[PDB]
Design a protein around this nucleic acid. Sequence first.
RNA 1: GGGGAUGACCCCAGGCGGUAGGGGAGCGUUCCCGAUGCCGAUGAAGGCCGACCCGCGAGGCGGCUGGAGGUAAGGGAAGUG
RNA 2: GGUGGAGCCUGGGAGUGAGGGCGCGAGCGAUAACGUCCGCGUCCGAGCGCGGGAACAACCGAGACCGCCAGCUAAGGCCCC
RNA 3: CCGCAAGGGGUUGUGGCGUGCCUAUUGAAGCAUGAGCCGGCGACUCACGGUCGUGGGCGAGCUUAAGCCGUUGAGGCGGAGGCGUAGGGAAACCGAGUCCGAACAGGGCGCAAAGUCCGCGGCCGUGGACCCGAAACCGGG
RNA 4: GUGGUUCGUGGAGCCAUGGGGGAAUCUGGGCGGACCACCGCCUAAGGCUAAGUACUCCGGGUGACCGAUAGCGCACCAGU
RNA 5: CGGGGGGAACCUGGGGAACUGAAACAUCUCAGUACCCAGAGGAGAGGAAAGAGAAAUCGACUCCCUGAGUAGCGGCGAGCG
Lengths: 84, 189, 63, 53
Amino acid sequence: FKRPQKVQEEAATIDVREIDENVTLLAADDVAEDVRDVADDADYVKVLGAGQVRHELTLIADDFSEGAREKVEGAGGSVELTDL
Amino acid sequence: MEATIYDNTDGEVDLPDVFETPVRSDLIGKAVRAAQANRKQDYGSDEYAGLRTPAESFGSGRGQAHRVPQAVKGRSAHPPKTEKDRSLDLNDKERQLAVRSALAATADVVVSDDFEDLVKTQEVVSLLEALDVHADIDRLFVTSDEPSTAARNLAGADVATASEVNTEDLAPGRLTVFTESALAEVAER
Amino acid sequence: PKMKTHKMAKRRIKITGTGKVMAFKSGKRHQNTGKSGDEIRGKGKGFVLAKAEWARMKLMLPR
Amino acid sequence: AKDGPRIIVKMESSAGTGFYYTTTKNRRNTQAKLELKKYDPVAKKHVVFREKK
RNA sequence: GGGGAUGACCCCAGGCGGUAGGGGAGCGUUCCCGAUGCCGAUGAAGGCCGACCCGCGAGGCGGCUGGAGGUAAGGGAAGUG
RNA sequence: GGUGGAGCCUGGGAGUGAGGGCGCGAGCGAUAACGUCCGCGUCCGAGCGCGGGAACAACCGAGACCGCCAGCUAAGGCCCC
RNA sequence: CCGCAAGGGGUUGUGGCGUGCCUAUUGAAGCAUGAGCCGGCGACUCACGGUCGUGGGCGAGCUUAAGCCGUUGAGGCGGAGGCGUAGGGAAACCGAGUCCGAACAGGGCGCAAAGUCCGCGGCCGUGGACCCGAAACCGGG
RNA sequence: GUGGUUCGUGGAGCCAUGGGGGAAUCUGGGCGGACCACCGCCUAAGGCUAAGUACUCCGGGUGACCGAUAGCGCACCAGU
RNA sequence: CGGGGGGAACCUGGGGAACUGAAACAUCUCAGUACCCAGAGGAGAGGAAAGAGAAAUCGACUCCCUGAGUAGCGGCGAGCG
């Protein structure tokens, strides 16, 4: 069912409990009130829900799952790229 | 613990956790291999001699049977392929780990910085009188940022430096002396 | 180097990390079949076992 | 299927335009132009289906 | 399987014909280590013969040969039987 | 369930993918063939290597880990070789 | 005859029992093949992929091309990248949910059980790739 | 009507051309893959340009490369 | 005045193939491979843009790794890429 050639768009798999945790590690930098956009395991910052939002942080990322953004509401804040 | 500082009568320094640990043989050996491994060279049996000429594989019907394999001085069969990738690249982390636990093994002798100055191989003769032994026979020469000059050539020459010396260097059953910034090698560790 | 009957990779052919794979039902249809309706109720996915091995394998690497 | 100009010709129907259609095989056999039955386009539900094609 | 000290010993169970073929384990072969390894003109090797070791592929050893080696108690390597 | 020891799933490494021989139940076939065709048991597999029926895989007994100067039996035999 | 003596050495008269050896065979002394003798050559390997096993180094793990360091000549530093870190779909895209569909019925998944690099190894793909073995097609002469 | 290209006649372009038509010199003219609008890009239809990769007749080194049936077939009145 | 005649292998251009794989074979692959040719060199190749790509970004040509065995070409079959 594939194409007559290239093109391809983007975005990417990043997420909830994932960041609260290894980000716990991320504490080395923007992990106080958090200002997110790591540079340590991914490529094009979306965030899956599941887990239980924490660490009160705001993310300069692309976007996040239903649950995602909601629990986010639970313990932090949202910040979406270039223009959203 | 017992990290003995040269210039004998003079002071003592401490053995760090790093070297301390307990030892990893399988690995050590690995290191070794890594070593000679990427070092060797390679060999081959003449492509030309082996598949060059014109072979007239004498038809049939005639009382016989057939540039190919199995008569003599040629063919080879599956030769020292000059065509055989000799390398063996272990793996950074692996390797350094190696120089590591290995060196621990070495701890099982502390080159007091001042020494980076002594200017004569007979002077070597001297420090030697200072601590000779069969382990001494082992003897490995280590300075710490750019060699202990003269030290470098004697009935046991060699001179690694605080950065760039490794199991290859001496993990190999030997015994030795690294200058303190060589302990900077420690740093590397 | 290496590859995949990039073909079967494409028509029918995909893996879930389970290390398993599926392709489309394929039992009739998409050629003849004035045939029926409820039978048409026959084209979600087919999971052929064991063989999904030459399969998987030959694809190996990407999919 | 096996296009047979024999008393066996394929045909289908429409839902007044409930939109598309559904699958039928038929026979001049008896009744020519004739062809009416009811169905359910993706369009809502039911509808008058004329079968000719 | 019943203890095993490392062996090993003991009981019984318990078989143990075997090609394609699948699994374990050893042997000598010319090479790279001489993992705080070197024998030899009173012989290196290979040869020539043998009623101590091994289940064995081999060992050792003693005798005579012949002129110069090369072994490695241990791992590595393969144009190996 | 007396059994004891096969049983099941997951996965790597396999071979052969064409045998025939016998008894029995069918085919076919002149109820002909050390014919063939399927079937039910075994057989044989280049070693299912010993016994025998002469000799004879291969049909009756029989499972061959290894013990020359032991003993009980199979089937099969015991006037002689 | 006793250079390892009351036991073996060599040779054999007799007597017992006894069909070679290798290929390929339903089946083999073979009368089927193979091979006249002795000595040396001689045939499942390497490379890159991938794969499963495992020895072992961290679980996020790991290395290019290079630059520099080099009796021995010493390795070190390089962080484009690529394999795990959810995935469901054709896709939009959503997303631990996800497709079909408009229905709470199923398929994929979630469920960490987590890899990952390197080492040696049974194997597979491309390689002349267990070894020799023909007719023949094609190129230049 | 052919070529290169990953393109096997294809939704199929760019450059290169075989054969016929045969433009415009800066609001020129191709370009971003059919095409159309707007944008973005380049400025052809002349020439030279050391160095960074290949190669081995020849010289050097070095080899867990060979030992005369192995090494290039030829270690020496051998491509004879 | 310069040429030509060399030259093991290397370069570019001119011309430019069957086997073999697709378990046939007409597409195709083997390849722009082998070969033959002309010619420059010590190296030729090529080489400052009617480029790239699109983040309003990049700026010789070449060669390594990487990109991708991806994007994809295709009796969408071997494979090629």
